[PDB]
Structure 1
Amino acid sequence: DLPLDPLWEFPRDRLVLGKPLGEGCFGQVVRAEAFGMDPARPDQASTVAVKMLKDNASDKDLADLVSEMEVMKLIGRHKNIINLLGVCTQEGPLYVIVECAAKGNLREFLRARRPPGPDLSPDGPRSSEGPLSFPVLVSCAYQVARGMQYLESRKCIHRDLAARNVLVTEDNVMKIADFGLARGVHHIDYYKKTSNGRLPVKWMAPEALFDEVYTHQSDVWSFGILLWEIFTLGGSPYPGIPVEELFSLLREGHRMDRPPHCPPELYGLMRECWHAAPSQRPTFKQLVEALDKVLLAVSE
């Protein structure tokens, strides 16, 4: 139906579709095996993630997926984003084939790796030692910032940057996902709670929430919320605060408390990201450098 772009088109018979990975506002994502994604190695298998529509898709749904496809084509390659690998547009359903992130999203990655509580019986030399260490947490924040810096340099605004939209590869590389999305910003249900209990309004910069204004600086606000997620090891922001109360607390200039076991350097960066004036928040370039300073100081 769509025109053939030989740069990106991949034969669909070289895909074997596997288990669904999740469902979005438009489309679903399925795990898949690809053969010959590298044309030099035509019979080589690789694991990829395939974006496609749901069975109840509207023409808007298709338009949104096509739009996402065209954004991916233009963004280019970066270590810290989910990269476009190919598309299937001819003689069958629309597939947008992207990198697969074997460990799933960063929020569940952190929550699954919280340290053992004090109820655990000591068993061997490391029973106190959880999987997550401070330098790895800082490297996670640093990588997200570098990925966001790259997206900004390509004039891409994410608009729902959150731990759940960052994915983790088999080597613990952070990759920003779903950056190219039509997000219906003129009809957000602010009271919307997801199937997993998320209130996405808790990531929106004030100018986005109150004035429907998005810039790279409003993504910086969301980044500070994501820093808070990281250093609470996957915690939900504004603990215990329902949306009605979020609205007035934000109007009053309320910010989240410094969370436990979080050095003042990192809470300082959080509070900078949540300065009222978007021009008084750091840029992603400044965040990359600041986090790099910490990461180097603690990676002896």
Structure 2
Amino acid sequence: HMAGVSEYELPEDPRWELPRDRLVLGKPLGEGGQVVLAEAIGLDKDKPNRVTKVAVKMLKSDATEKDLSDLISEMEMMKMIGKHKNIINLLGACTQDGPLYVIVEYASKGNLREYLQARRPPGLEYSYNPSHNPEEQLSSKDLVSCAYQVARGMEYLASKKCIHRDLAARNVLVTEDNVMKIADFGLARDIHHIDYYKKTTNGRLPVKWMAPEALFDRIYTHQSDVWSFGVLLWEIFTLGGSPYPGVPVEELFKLLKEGHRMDKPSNCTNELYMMMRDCWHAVPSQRPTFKQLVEDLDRIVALTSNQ
């Protein structure tokens, strides 16, 4: 476990520091680290009487000293990377008079995976809609536009020397205005060899988004992120589909080595599928960059129908 919060010297930053009484705790948003919904009073000094819905990150009742440094690490990392419309930005923090709170932007519509699944057409082209409360079906343009925003955010993160290392639909959140925001891009990398078998609390296997070199040699770069983006693209056009269906984790090693790739999803243009194949190129140097991906997608968004 960890020592008292007072036992440690939390990084106090006047620009982001916010009084704890200015935060009105709400319902839990995520459990891993712990996130909860909250209402901040006067986040913007220019308007101290305005309330704003935000997400509050805090450690668990059972946290290690490393967990505290990791959280701080992400906070300072977000400051470094800066702000961008397509990423979950830092809003403030509480480093005094209580536990450490890292305030970030709130995405009312949850992660992209569940977002899409809830908007699956009754048709046959997709799996059955899991959501008990279906939503309006997205247009063809909406999906490509969704890919554009994600690639847009990654392009920015790439220009900031930031390597996500786990880009996936689950790691992309949707705002109330349907804006795509990449999350968990400032997390600290573990210094202990990974367990390709470990599964997330959501029952997700990170190995399915990892590039061959990142999976076999544990090498992470912007190129490996482009690979993940290729898998993310696959998820979009499958409306929250599961990568490599019916393929065991252990089998994934051989298959990927064989140069095998996922088949084009139903209702997916060949141009968009070729983009996925280019991202899934065997040679890192041959995969396209986020800069290019943003350009092609922009061109595609303008051509793609919205009806």
TM-score bracket, shorter-length normalisation: over 0.9
Q: Is the partner of 1:257 in helix, strand or coil?
A: coil
Cα deviation 1:106-150 (Å, max 9, x = unaligned): 0000001100247xxxxxxxxxx9611110000000000000000
What is the CA distance between 1:15 and its match in structure 2? 0.2
Offset at residue 64 of structure 1 (A) = 0.5
Find out whether 1:84 has 2:90 as its counterpart.
yes
Secondary structure, counterpart of 1:163 in structure 2 = coil
Residue type of the alignment partner of 1:166 = V
Letter in 2 for 1:135: K
1:191 aligned onto 2:197: yes
Q: Which of 55, 69, 72 is the aligned partner of 2:61?
A: 55
Identify unmatched segments of 5+ residues in structure 1. Answer: 119-128
Q: Give the C-alpha shift of residue 3 in structure 1.
A: 3.8
Give % identity: 77
Deviations 1:243-296 (A, max 9, x none): 011011011111111111110011000000000111100000000001011001
> Match for 1:78: what amino acid?
H
281, 285, 290: which one aligns with 1:279: 285
Q: How much does 1:183 deviate?
A: 3.4
The secondary structure found in structure 2 opposite 1:102 is coil
Write the distance in 2 (CA, Å) between the matches of 1:98 and 1:299.
Answer: 34
TM value normalised by structure 1:
0.93
Match of 1:289 among 291, 295, 305: 295
Mind listing any 5+ residue stretches in structure 2 that lack a counterpart? 1-8, 125-134
How many angstroms does 1:77 deviate by?
A: 1.1
TM-score scaled by length of structure 2: 0.91
> C-alpha separation between the residues in 2 aligned to 1:85 and 1:256?
39
Partner of 2:29: 21
Q: In the alignment, what sits opposite 1:240?
A: 246
**1:62-141, aligned counterparts within 5 Å?**
62-117=68-123, 131-141=137-147
**Aligned partners of 2:74, 2:118: CA distance in 1, in Å?**
31
User: 1:185 Cα shift?
Assistant: 6.2
In 1, distance between residues paired with 2:176 and 2:253?
39
2: distance between equivalents of 1:50 and 1:106?
Answer: 20
CA distance in 2, matches of 1:252, 1:3: 48
> How well do the aligned residues superpose, as a CA RMSD in angstroms?
1.4
- 1:8 paired with 2:16, answer yes
Q: Which amino acid aligns with 1:287?
A: L
- Give the conservation status (yes or no) of the 8 Å contact 1:146–1:288: yes
